Design an enzyme around this catalytic site. Structure first.
Site: not given
Ligand SMILES: Nc1nc2c(c(=O)[nH]1)N[C@H]1C(S)=C(S)[C@@H](COP(=O)(O)OP(=O)(O)OC[C@H]3O[C@@H](n4cnc5c(=O)[nH]c(N)nc54)[C@H](O)[C@@H]3O)O[C@H]1N2
Ligand SMILES: Nc1nc2c(c(=O)[nH]1)N[C@H]1C(S)=C(S)[C@@H](COP(=O)(O)OP(=O)(O)OC[C@H]3O[C@@H](n4cnc5c(=O)[nH]c(N)nc54)[C@H](O)[C@@H]3O)O[C@H]1N2
Ligand code: F3S
Ligand code: FES
Ligand code: FES
Ligand SMILES: [Mo+4]
Ligand code: NA
Lengths: 822, 134, 135
Positions: B82, B63
């Site tokens: 996240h 990510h």
């Protein structure tokens, strides 16, 4: 693989809003000739990032999925890179897994978009073939014309997007709406997600509170956030990540204090009303601690009882704004009487203990020490919108919000979290009754049905009844077509029309892809998505952005607004040829060469002198917005409505609605409503009485909607080759199933299939199935039941589960590990 | 000319020093790329070593690049940024999260003669790099 | 390296206005062992360059087994004497009929209005008998 081609320093850069969810995250599209590349030095590439050494965390979001090579109409090849904008206020450089795939889901001849519709497709009785656009229009317009002349508009059916973003937006909703409503003038129209021409938000709008009444900054300013029927880490990722979590982490405290010098701001807390323990519950607990999260794990369908118990309690404690109620509301004293429910009754109905009910009220409504009520943002989505009586739940919830003055204050709002983006500009709906379109089709009505930008085979409620009926009616037309040999287009129109007098239905799909609708469609027309066209839309805080065209559509694929114009002009031409000047005149006003023309005709004409009646999210200042002005605004755009424009200031818009206490009702006051508790609908209760499991359903983080792109993505298909059903492990053991087994899920309404996904957090006798999917359609087991406005209780069905057997391959390739982070 | 990256061949350890479900840390293909090798205890497709069960990964989240942590109880890599989680038993498959790429696999040669594990390549692109080899 | 792209030379072919309709010009690109033709077709085609968007250029080596193909002015095709493959000059080297599995490679030309120059700057497709277009 193991490398990426960097964008050159001088690469072309356009703005692009995410294609998918409501959040409307801002991205940049870099475009450059295939045989050029950027250098690793930060000033020699377009990103400005130093690829001479490892980058730190948060420096970039960049994978091969965010890159592609497109082949344009001129045959020339161009690298593209679709990446989040760091300076966009919405997402601050965040990309979800869904938006992160945009580059991969752009059209290329060999990639994930390889099966994009590139020309008209015709099922010529017994086989799919290509056809020309002119032949397609002659057949489609021909039928519509015949139906208008003989049956009137009531023979012509649509199910059409009303939404924003890709497969929606202001140009497209105007185009379709003008066609359906001003030109054809058919009332036989449903919406992509619901089977009549209605709203998700009848109650709250009629109470004077439109459902997108705040800013994302309000989620930063709140003391408390409620997430009601809502799994926002998965469904509204970057609003949750970029706005909610910073509040929970204390990063916004100093901004609260700067705004309100004389007000206490405790650590922020979060309350979830959801029968199910979701990833969002888990992640909230991880970030904030268990002591700052309340999961009100209600019994399915008991929202109304919940809110009536909270409303009753806050009134009895006096945790309400009596000056607000007195100056700015009507109907309070009535609502106190009709909605009265003790906490004990509330607890018995909901299953939520009295202590938890009291704590939720205490966090949310009890004055802080400094005197002011908590800033409590009440965020809701499909757990209540598709819940037990849409109208009544919103009535109950809004009563609580209005009494506690949680609209119109910063850090507050009673808002939809949203689904798609928004981008609605349309003429008024031309009927005076709600019509349950699926039921009409099932009962044999209509000559022609168009699915436009939607796929109700995968997404209707009671979807099995729908598919059955449509396939059979489609077959009658197929059978009639096949007796023709050498017929002109006009003769074919008559043959098909005749077949529809004997139960048949002509089916058209206007789409990016064949989809499952190809099992019934006779005609399919190719559409274009953002980046292949310019497109405007707004997010959950009404922020309007322009998504810039940067590439050509596949083959002869067209913008939906321009397909609508094509259809209108074909009908106009037929009427002019037939000597019917009055009927021709109804199809005027589609002289459109580009999507911008649809923007000028719709959004920019709302409320202007000499304009017809237009319902627009832009309102009457929409004319101040132009494509060039949106370009200058960037991915930040402007929050609608626009209040002013000049060259030196730009577009100046509106942060929060209702901050002076003037609501959208006759008297300017917010209106309380009665909210009776009547249990579950008898149709749903009968399912619950007969069958074992609650068949909850909805979203997966990774999967977008009906998996129209995702079905072609090898990673997506390896991860979720089949729709999954979250099952309690003890229920699993009872049925002798485990991860990667296939089950039949069934009831009186239908039968479908899922792969078993054991989930410890699922309650016994409850389940959760992925909705909308390409392999195992959940909606077969949803009931026909709708509220008074024909809103389905999609989250309200029960059924039994039968083991089909073990899919070895799923066990070898699919993870069944926990999706709730701890 | 060349179409492939010039990966180094880096010794990690001998296979028999690895204990089941106890991650070993190393850098590959340079000291700014943190990796883990773990003996899973049970054969998995493409596992190396005597029990075909040793796997290895880049631990930088695909990510936005936070170092992930190996959870021994689930045999996953979890990202605190996240909340992405990758399956060490399914070649870095994303279980849930915001990444668009599986966790990159470090390709290990296993030499029976010496019992050596050597990192020789990467399958996937490591976070925050134009190429796996800088 | 970093680099994912081949280092193509920039080679002057001619100025556009010197080209006569349907009269092929020979040149080598990206080196003297790679024979190429540029032709003004006389009518615009997708991706044609020059004032009338009609100038196209190709590698003339057959993508089957590498015989130099010959431009036929009457059909505007390149024909291979080896196994009778024929490529369309007006459809970006599309194979009309033949044994190849790849279109005739296109030489990418920059056209500069200011100078009227055509410069060969790249190749779209792989030239026969080469691991990479640039040796
Ligand atoms: N059981 C159950 N059923 C549900 C729900 C639920 O929670 N439970 N939720 C409901 C909800 S909230 C919704 S929004 C609906 C969704 O129902 P649908 O709208 O049927 O599903 P989507 O996948 O949004 O459909 C988009 C379609 O348009 C196509 N498309 C994409 N881009 C474009 C474009 O630019 N133009 C055109 N013309 N076509 C385009 C896609 O390929 C796809 O076929 O499902 C509803 N159904
Ligand atoms: N990853 C991803 N995100 C999406 C989409 C997608 O397909 N993929 N679709 C977009 C769209 S169109 C929409 S409409 C939104 C959907 O966003 P959400 O509504 O946030 O998503 P859902 O999964 O449909 O349902 C939310 C929750 O409702 C709960 N629920 C079920 N029954 C009840 C009930 O009776 N009462 C209450 N209070 N809760 C109940 C379910 O347990 C579930 O967690 O997501 C949008 N974002
Ligand atoms: S990237 Fe797209 S899917 Fe929603 S969270 Fe952001 S708009
Ligand atoms: S940085 Fe790892 S999940 Fe975002
Ligand atoms: S070498 Fe040209 S057709 Fe075979
Ligand atoms: Mo929706
Ligand atoms: Na079924």
């Amino acid at each position: 693989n193991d490398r990426i081609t960097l964008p050159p320093a001088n690469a072309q850069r356009t703005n692009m809003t995410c294609h998918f969810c409501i959040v409307g995250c801002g991205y940049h599209v870099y475009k450059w000739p295939e045989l050029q590349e950027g250098g690793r030095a930060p000033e020699q590439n377009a990103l400005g990032l130093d690829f001479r050494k490892q980058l730190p965390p948060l420096a970039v979001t960049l994978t091969p999925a965010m890159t592609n090579v497109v082949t344009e109409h001129n045959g020339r090849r161009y690298n593209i890179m679709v990446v989040p904008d760091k300076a966009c206020v919405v997402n601050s450089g965040l990309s979800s897994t869904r938006g992160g795939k945009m580059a991969s889901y752009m059209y290329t001849p060999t990639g994930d978009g390889k099966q994009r519709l590139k020309a008209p497709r015709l099922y010529a009785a017994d086989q799919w073939v290509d056809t020309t656009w002119d032949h397609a229009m002659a057949l489609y317009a021909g039928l519509i014309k015949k139906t208008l002349d003989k049956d009137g508009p009531q023979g012509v059916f649509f199910s059409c997007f009303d939404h924003g973003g890709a497969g929606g937006g202001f140009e497209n909703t105007w185009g379709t709406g003008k066609l359906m409503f001003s030109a054809i003038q058919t009332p036989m129209v449903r919406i992509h997600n619901r089977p009549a021409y209605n709203s998700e938000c009848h109650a709250t709008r009629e109470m004077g509170i439109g459902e997108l009444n705040n800013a994302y900054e309000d989620a930063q300013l709140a003391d408390v956030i409620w997430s009601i029927g809502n799994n926002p880490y998965e469904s509204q990722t970057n609003y949750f990540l970029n706005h909610w979590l910073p509040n929970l982490q204390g990063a916004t405290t100093s901004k609260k204090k700067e705004r309100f010098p004389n007000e206490n701001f405790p650590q922020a807390r979060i309350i979830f009303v959801d029968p199910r323990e979701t990833p969002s519950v888990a992640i909230a607990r991880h970030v904030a601690g268990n002591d700052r999260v309340l999961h009100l794990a209600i019994e399915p369908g008991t929202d109304t009882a919940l809110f009536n118990g909270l409303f009753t309690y806050v009134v009895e404690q006096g945790w309400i704004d009596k000056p607000f109620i007195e100056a700015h509301t009507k109907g309070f004293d009535d609502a106190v009487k009709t909605n009265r429910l003790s906490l004990d009754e509330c607890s018995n109905i909901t299953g939520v203990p009295v202590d938890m009910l009291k704590r939720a009220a205490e966090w949310s409504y009890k004055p802080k020490a400094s005197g002011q009520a908590p800033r409590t943002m009440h965020a809701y989505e499909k757990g209540i919108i598709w819940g037990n009586d849409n109208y009544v739940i919103q009535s109950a919830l809004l009563d609580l919000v209005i009494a506690t003055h949680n609209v119109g204050r910063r850090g507050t709002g009673c808002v939809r979290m949203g689904g798609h983006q928004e981008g609605y500009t349309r003429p008024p709906y031309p009927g005076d009754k709600k019509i349950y379109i699926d039921q009409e089709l099932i009962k044999g009505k209509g000559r022609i049905m168009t699915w436009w930008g939607c796929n109700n085979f995968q997404t209707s409620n009671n979807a099995q009844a729908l598919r059955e009926a449509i396939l059979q009616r489609s077959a009658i037309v197929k059978q009639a077509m096949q007796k023709a040999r050498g017929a002109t287009t006009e003769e074919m129109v008559d043959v098909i029309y005749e077949a529809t007098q004997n139960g048949g239905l002509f089916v058209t799909s206007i789409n990016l892809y064949p989809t499952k609708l190809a099992e019934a469609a006779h005609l399919m027309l190719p559409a274009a998505h953002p980046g292949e066209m310019n497109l405007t839309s707004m997010n959950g805080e009404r922020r309007i952005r322009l998504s810039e065209k940067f590439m050509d559509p596949p083959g002869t694929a067209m913008a939906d607004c321009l397909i609508a114009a094509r259809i209108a002009n074909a009908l106009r031409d037929m009427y002019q040829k037939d000597g019917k000047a009055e009927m021709a005149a109804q199809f005027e006003g589609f002289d459109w060469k580009t999507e911008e023309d649809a923007f000028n005709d719709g959004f920019r004409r709302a409320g202007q002198p000499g304009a017809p009646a237009i319902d627009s999210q832009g309102g009457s200042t929409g004319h101040l917005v132009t494509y060039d002005r949106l370009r200058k605004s960037g991915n930040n755009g402007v929050q609608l409505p626009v209040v002013s424009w000049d060259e030196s200031k730009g577009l100046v818009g509106t942060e929060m609605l209702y901050t002076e206490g003037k609501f959208d009702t006759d008297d300017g006051k917010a209106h309380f409503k009665p909210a009776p508790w009547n249990g579950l609908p008898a149709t749903v209760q009968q399912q619950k009485d007969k069958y074992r499991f609650w068949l909850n359903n909805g979203r997966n983080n990774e999967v977008w909607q009906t998996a129209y792109h995702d079905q072609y993505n090898s990673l997506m298909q390896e991860r979720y080759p089949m729709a999954y059903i979250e099952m309690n492990p003890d229920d699993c053991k009872q049925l002798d199933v485990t991860g990667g087994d296939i089950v039949e899920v069934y009831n009186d309404f239908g039968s479908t299939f899922a792969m078993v996904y054991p989930v410890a957090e699922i309650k016994r006798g409850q389940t959760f199935m992925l909705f909308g999917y390409v392999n195992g359609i959940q909606g077969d087991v949803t009931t026909d039941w709708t509220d008074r406005n024909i809103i389905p209780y999609y989250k309200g069905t029960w059924g039994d589960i039968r083991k089909v057997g073990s899919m070895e391959e799923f066990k070898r390739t699919v993870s069944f590990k926990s999706r709730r982070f701890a | 000319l060349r179409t492939t990256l010039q990966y180094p061949a880096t010794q990690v350890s001998v296979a028999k020093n690895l204990k089941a479900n106890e991650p070993v840390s190393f850098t590959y293909p340079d000291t700014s790329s943190p990796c883990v090798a773990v003996k899973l205890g049970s054969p998995v497709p493409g596992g190396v070593g005597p029990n075909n069960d040793i796997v290895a990964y880049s631990v930088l989240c695909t990510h936005m690049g936070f170092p992930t942590s190996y959870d021994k109880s689930s045999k996953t890599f979890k990202c605190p940024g996240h909340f992405t989680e990758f399956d060490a038993e399914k070649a870095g498959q994303m279980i849930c999260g915001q990444a668009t790429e599986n966790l990159p696999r470090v390709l290990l040669r296993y030499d029976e003669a010496s019992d050596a594990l050597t990192a020789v390549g990467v399958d996937g692109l490591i976070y925050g790099r134009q190429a796996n080899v800088i």
